[PDB]
Amino acid sequence: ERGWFDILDDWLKRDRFVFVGWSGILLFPCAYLALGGWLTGTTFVTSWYTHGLASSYLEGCNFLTVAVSTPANSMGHSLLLLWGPEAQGDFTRWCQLGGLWTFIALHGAFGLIGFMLRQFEIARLVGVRPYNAIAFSAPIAVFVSVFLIYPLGQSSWFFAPSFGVAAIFRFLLFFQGFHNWTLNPFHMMGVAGVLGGALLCAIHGATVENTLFQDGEGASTFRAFNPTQAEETYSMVTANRFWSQIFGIAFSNKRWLHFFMLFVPVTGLWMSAIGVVGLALNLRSYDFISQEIRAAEDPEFETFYTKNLLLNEGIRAWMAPQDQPHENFVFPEEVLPRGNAL
Amino acid sequence: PLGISGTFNFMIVFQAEHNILMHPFHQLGVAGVFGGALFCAMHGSLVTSSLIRETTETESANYGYKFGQEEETYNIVAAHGYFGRLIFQYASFNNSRSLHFFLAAWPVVGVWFAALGISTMAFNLNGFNFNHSVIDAKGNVINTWADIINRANLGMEVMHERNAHNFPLDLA
Amino acid sequence: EPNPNRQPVELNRTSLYLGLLLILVLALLFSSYFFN
Amino acid sequence: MEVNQLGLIATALFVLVPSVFLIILYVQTESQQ
C-alpha cells in the first residue's frame, strides 16, 4: 500500500537541512507564533490597561524591562481567544486586554509538546534510545507548573509570570515575600539539582580535557580526535586515580557517569515543579510553628528565620499596592512596616 | 552567614542594597548555571541514548562498560546524527574534545562572572537603575516592571536590621 | 511446579552507599519540617 | 520548643524502612556466588 499517507510520510522525513517530520506540523507553527508573539508584544504592545505599566520598546522600555504582561485580574482564567466574548474579534482590544499572554503561553505549551515529539520521532528514525526526550520532560514539567498550574490555582492569569526579564525578577521577589519560597524543601532540591548539574558539567568537561591521550603532535589538542575512532580519547584510569586521591571517591563506570549527569538536573527540576504545584494553592512552607510559639512568648528569641519574615512583611506591604492595582490597596504612611530611620 | 536561612538573609539584603537581579554579571551567572545544568542533562542523555548494546534486558546497561577498557562505550556518530537532525547539522559537535571543552568552559566562565558580580558590588557598583526612567508628555511617571522591583526592594531595605540605623541613609 | 519467570536480584555495594546517602540526606532535609 | 512530637517517629521510620530495604538487597547479593 503506497497511498497518499505513505507518500506524505516520505516527504516529511526527507533528509534536509531542517528536518520536518510529522511532529513538525505541530512544532513549527506553534514555536514560530509563540516567538513572534513575544517579539511583537515586547516591541509594540502596552500593559497600561492590565497592569498600569509601560512594557514595549515603543513606549521607551529597554531589553530588560519589556514584557508581554499577563491579562487583568478581572479576566479570571479566560482563554482570551481572539474571537471570544471579551475581545470579540477586535485585534487591538485583544492586545490591550492581554490576549497575547494566553496566545504565547498556549502556543508555547503546544510547541513544547511538538519539540518532545520531534525528539521521539528523530530518535526512532536514527535508531537511538529516546533518553533526550525523557530528559526534556523536566523543562516541560517546569513550564506547565509555573505558567499554567500555578495561576490556575490562584485567582487569575494575572498572577502567572509575565514574559520579560524584569517581569520575571518581580516574580522571584513576589515568591519570596508572599510564599517564603526559599524555605521550601522542593525548591531546595531543585537548587541542588541545578547547581549539582552545573558542577557535573564543569567537572566532567575539565576532567576529560585534562586526561587526554597524546594522539597528535600539535599543541592544540582538538585536532587529534576522529569521530569514528574506536579508542577512548581520554584516560578513564588516570581520571579515576586522580579523583580517588583528591576527593576520596571517583566514577569508575562511564555509562553510570553519563546517566548520573542526566539524572541530577532532571530530577531537580521535577522536584521544584512539585513545590510550585503546592504554591498554586498557597500550600506553602512559610513558617516553623515551634519557632513562632517561642518567639511570640520570648521577645529575646531571634533567629535568621524570624529575621527573614520581617523582610517578607516589608516586601508584601511596600509592593502590593503597585503590583496588585485591581485590589485598590491604600496603605497610609503610618501603617507601613519600617525599621528605625529607614 | 554559615547557615541555610542565613544564606537567604544575605541574598535578600544583597538585592535591596545592590539590585543584583539587574546586574549583568549575576545574569551571566544565571546563564552559567542554567546552561551548565542544561548541557549536563544534554550530554548525559546523548551519551546514554547511544550506548552500544552489550547487555540483555534483565541486566543494567552499566555492566556493558568495563573499567579501563580501550574502546569507547557509545557511538558518537549516532549521537551527532540524532542531535544534528534535532537542530541542524552544524549546531552539533562531532569532536568529543571540543564538546567536552565547551562543557567545561560554559559553567566555569559564567560562575567567574557571578563571583565578579559579588566582588564588584562589594564596591557598590550596582545593578541597572531604571527607576522612573519612563515619563509621559506631561512628566507623569509611567511605571515599568523595574519600578515594581523597586517597590519590593524598598520593603526589604526598610525592614532589614530594623534597630541598627539611626540616620536616614544606609551607606554600608 | 516451578515458575520459569523467576530472576535473581542484585544491589551492589556502590548502590548501597549511594542509596544510604540519598536517604540520610533526605531525612536531614525533611526532619526539620516534620518537627515543625 | 513545642515541636510536633510525631516528628520523631516520622523521621525514624523515614530513615529506617528504606535503609533496611537496601541492606537486605545488598547482603543477599554478597551471599550469592
Binding site: 584510569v237 576520596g248 571517591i249 | 573499567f67 | 540520610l24 | 520548643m1 520523631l8 523521621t11 525514624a12
Partner: peptide
C-alpha cells in the same frame, strides 16, 4: 529530642563517608 535526631543523622552521614572511601569496591582494570 529534635537536636539528638539532627546530630544522629549527621553522624551517620560522616560514618557513611568513611566506609564509602576506605571500604569501597576497588576499581579493577580489564
Amino acid at each position: 529530642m529534635e537536636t539528638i535526631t539532627y546530630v544522629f543523622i549527621f553522624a551517620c552521614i560522616i560514618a557513611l563517608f568513611f566506609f564509602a572511601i576506605f571500604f569501597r569496591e576497588p576499581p579493577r582494570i580489564t
